[PDB]
Amino acid sequence: MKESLKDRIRLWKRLYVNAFENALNAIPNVKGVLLAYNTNIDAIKYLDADDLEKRVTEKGKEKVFEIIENPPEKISSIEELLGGILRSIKLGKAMEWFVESEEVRRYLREWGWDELRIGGQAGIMANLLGGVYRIPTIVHVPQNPKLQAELFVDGPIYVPVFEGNKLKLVHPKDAIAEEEELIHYIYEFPRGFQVFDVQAPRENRFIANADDYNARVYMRREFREGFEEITRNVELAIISGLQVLKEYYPDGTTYKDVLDRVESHLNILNRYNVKSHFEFAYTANRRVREALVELLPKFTSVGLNEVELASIMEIIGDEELAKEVLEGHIFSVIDAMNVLMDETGIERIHFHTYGYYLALTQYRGEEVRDALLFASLAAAAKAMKGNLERIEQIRDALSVPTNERAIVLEEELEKEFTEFENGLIDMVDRQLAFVPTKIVASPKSTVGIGDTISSSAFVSEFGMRKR
Ligand SMILES: Nc1ncnc2c1ncn2[C@@H]1O[C@H](COP(=O)(O)OP(=O)(O)O)[C@@H](O)[C@H]1O
Hints:
Layout: H1 5-26, E1 33-36, E2 40-46, H2 49-59, H3 61-69, H4 78-90, E3 95-98, H5 102-111, E4 115-119, H6 121-132, E5 137-139, H7 146-149, E6 157-162, E7 167-170, E8 183-189, E9 194-195, E10 198-199, E11 204-209, H8 221-225, H9 227-231, E12 236-239, H10 255-271, E13 275-279, H11 286-295, E14 301-304, H12 306-315, H13 319-326, H14 330-344, E15 348-353, E16 356-361, H15 367-385, H16 393-396, H17 404-416, E17 418-421, E18 424-426, E19 431-436, H18 449-465
Parallel strand pairs: 1-5, 1-12, 2-8, 3-11, 5-6, 12-13, 13-14, 14-15
Antiparallel strand pairs: 2-4, 6-7, 8-11, 9-10, 15-16, 16-19, 17-18, 18-19
Helix pairs in contact: 1-15, 1-18, 2-3, 2-4, 3-4, 6-18, 12-13, 12-14, 13-14, 15-18
The protein binds adenosine-5'-diphosphate.
C-alpha cells in the first residue's frame, strides 16, 4: 500500500506522543539503577576571542601554532593546551587531551569556568535518571569533595557508604569527604568563532582532562567490597568509563587489573539477574578493545554509534563491513548489528546515529520502538534546553520536526524486510526496530546527549516490558 510522505509524517507524530505517554507511565516501575565507574566535575568556559587572543600571544602564538599542526599526546605545557583548543577550533572537531602538568593545572583553574555541572557518563546519567526520571539511582563517585557532591540534583540519588560493617545508601551531600576535585575543563565555541586567522566551521569543544582517578578507573571501597550488597538494591545497571583503559601503564600495571574486577561485578549482576547495559564508547587501544568485546556476552544490552560499531567490526575481522558502516550505509549497519549478535549472543543492541536509531533484540514487542521514541524526544529536549530538570520539558520536544529523510528511508526497509508495524521488523529469531529521530538545529548543551539516548531507551524499555 502506497504511503505519501506527509501521511508518514503524520503517522510518526502519533507514535511519538504515544511512546511518550507510555514511557511516563512505565518509568515508575523500575525499582533501581546502578550507574558505574565514571563521575566527575565539568567546568565549562565559553571561549572569548579577545581572551584567547590575549592568551595565545602571551605564551607566544609561535609554539602555539606549531601545536596546531603537530598535536602532542597529552597536555604537558600551556602551549599544548592553547594549541589544542585552537586546533579543535580549526578542524571544528571535538577533542580531549589529558593534562599531565600540575603547572598547566594551576593555569586552568586561574583561567576559570563559566559554570559547573556533573561530569562522567555515570554522573550525567545519575542526574537524569534520578533527578529527572526520579528512578532511585545508586552511583559510583570516586572522589566526593563538597564541590562534587553539590553538583548532584535533588532526588532519589544515592551513594553507598560503609557505616560500621553496615552498608548504607545516602545522598552524595551526606557523604562528603576531604577528597580531590576531578575536573574536566570544557571549552566551547559557536558555529562561527573568531581567533587569529582561524575560523570554526562548527560549534564544538575541547576538553582538558585533569582527572587522575577516572583515568585508571579506581573503585571506591564499597564497590570493591560490598558490591553484592549494592546489587541487591537494583533492577538494572549501566556500565561505562572503560574506554580509557590502556594496555600498559608506567607503574607496571595493566588493563587486566581493572577488567578482572569488572568481570566479577558482571557475574554478581548476572547472579542476581540484573539487566545491564554497556556503553561501548570508542576504545583507541586494540588489545583493550578486543578484551571489552569478549566481555560483551556477559551484558544484556549494548549501545554504540557508527564509529564504535565499525571499530568492533575491524577487530572482529569484518574489515569490509566496517568501511561501509563508517560510510553510513544503513543496510550495512544492520548487517554489522546481526554479525555482532551472532558473535556475542547479546540480547540487545541499540545503535544510534544522526537521523535515526536502530535496536536489534532477541525478544519482540512494541516497547523497543516506543523506548527508542522516548529516547529521541529526551535527546531533543536535552539539546534544546541544554539542561533538563523536569520530565515535562521533554514534552516540548514533540514540537521538533522529525528527520524527514529518515522517514523516506523507512520505505526501503519496508521493501527489504518484514515490517509488521511501523519501525518494527520481524526476523526469524529476533526483531529489528527503526525510529526516525528529532534533530535540533543549533543545540544548547550537546555534552551528554549520547548518554541521554542510551540510558533513556534502556531504562524506559525495561519499565514498559516489566509491563
Ligand atoms: N543537535 C542534536 N539534535 C538531536 N540529536 C543529536 C544532536 N547532536 C547529537 N545528537 C545525537 O546524540 C548522539 C551523540 O552521541 P555519541 O555519538 O555517542 O557522542 P557523544 O557521547 O559525544 O554525545 C548522536 O549519535 C545523535 O544521534
